[PDB]
């Protein structure tokens, strides 16, 4: 499992763009692509995981564990006390995978401490805990990310609103940005300030699966059935060919079987 390092505490927009292209390269499958878009691997390709180490301000760090197959966050770790690695598995990781988030985020036994996340990773959950009606009311931004790392890393007690707010900002900034070129550019365009998620960033997050299947199943660039979407103002946005939506998407979720490659 490889780990990608990015310094949040001191960055430029290129430094954010390189990180992301190292995540995409590392996560994607080596041969599959539909219409020039990289596709994520089947569950069976090894390695199964990527680690994303986030360096905040004041020597604060969080290592984010992700699955290659669908780039979701399984949980995170932070340095705790002198020599402990504290791992935090999301409530909805089960089976071997739970031993796998432990073993991979904190590779040395003797030093491990558990502090689970007592809620699942779905956005409606994370919003109830932030105590907000919609992620859209919570601002995103590099300084917001840094400052949230600093509310979580090496702190004895931290509250669910604090934790959900960290994960809303970090899943959107790392896994949503990497799947969508559109969300990456929203973050580049506002790099020096805080900004509210617009309807399209939110809509793109929630329809990725359907987008991946449409694109895979498309013949001659024509999508199987029109794909109703929402744009940055809230307006119904209806795309029909792969060329419409492909600017906005960097990685495809796995769908098996063939598709037009290039």
Of 157, 163, 171, give the one whose Cα is nearest residue 80.
Answer: 157
Task: List the strands of the sheet with 73-80, edge to edge.
Answer: 2-7, 49-55, 61-67, 73-80, 84-89, 112-114
Active-site residue identified among 72, 98, 244, 254: 72
Determine if residue 73 is labeled as part of a ligand binding site: yes
Nearby residues of 94 by Cβ (< 8 Å), 6 or more positions away: none
CA distances from 66 to 76, 78, 175 (A): 9, 15, 8
CA distances from 145 to 3, 124, 159, 245 (A): 19, 20, 17, 28
Determine if residue 179 is labeled as part of a ligand binding site: yes
Determine whether 193 is an active site residue. no
Active-site residue identified among 24, 67, 68, 179: 179
CA distances from 60 to 35, 101, 124, 198, 258 (A): 40, 21, 28, 29, 44
Determine whether 72 is an active site residue. yes
Active-site residue identified among 123, 241, 244, 254: 123
Beta bridge partners of 200: none
Determine if residue 241 is labeled as part of a ligand binding site: no
Nearby residues of 191 by Cβ (< 8 Å), 6 or more positions away: 12, 13, 16, 142
Determine whether 176 is an active site residue. yes
Query: 183: how many CB neighbours lie within 10 A of its CB?
Result: 24
Active-site residue identified among 97, 102, 127, 176: 176
Nearby residues of 58 by Cβ (< 8 Å), 6 or more positions away: 9, 150
Place of tokens 């024509």: 222
Determine whether 182 is an active site residue. no
> Quick check: 114 and 24 in contact, CB under 8 A?
no
Binding site: which residues?
73, 121, 175, 179
Query: Which residues are the active-site residues?
Result: 72, 123, 176, 179
Binding site for substrate: which residues?
73, 121, 175, 179
């Amino acid at each position: 499992v490889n780990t990608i390092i990015y310094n949040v505490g001191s960055t430029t927009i290129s430094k954010y763009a390189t990180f992301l292209n190292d995540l995409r390269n590392e996560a994607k499958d080596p041969s599959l692509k539909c219409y020039g878009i990289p596709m994520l691997p089947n569950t069976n390709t090894n390695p199964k995981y990527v680690l994303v180490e986030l360096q905040g301000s004041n020597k604060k760090t969080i290592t984010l564990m992700l699955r290659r197959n669908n780039l979701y966050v399984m949980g995170y770790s932070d340095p705790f006390e002198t020599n402990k690695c504290r791992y935090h598995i999301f409530n909805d990781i089960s089976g071997t995978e739970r031993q796998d988030v432990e073993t991979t985020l904190c590779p040395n036994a003797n030093s491990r401490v558990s502090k689970n996340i007592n809620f699942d990773s779905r956005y409606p959950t994370l919003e109830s805990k932030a105590g907000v009606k919609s992620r859209s009311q919570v601002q995103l931004g590099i300084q917001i990310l840094d400052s949230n790392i600093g509310k979580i890393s090496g702190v004895m007690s931290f509250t669910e609103k604090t934790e959900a707010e960290f994960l809303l900002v970090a899943i959107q900034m790392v896994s949503e940005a990497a799947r969508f070129k559109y969300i990456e550019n929203q973050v580049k365009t506002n790099f020096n300030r805080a900004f509210n998620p617009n309807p399209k960033v939110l809509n793109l997050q929630e329809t990725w699966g359907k987008i991946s299947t449409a694109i895979h199943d498309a013949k001659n660039g024509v999508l199987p059935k029109p794909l109703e979407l929402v744009d940055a103002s809230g307006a119904k946005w209806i795309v029909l060919r792969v060329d419409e939506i492909k600017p906005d998407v960097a990685l495809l979720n796995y769908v098996g079987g063939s598709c037009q490659t290039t």
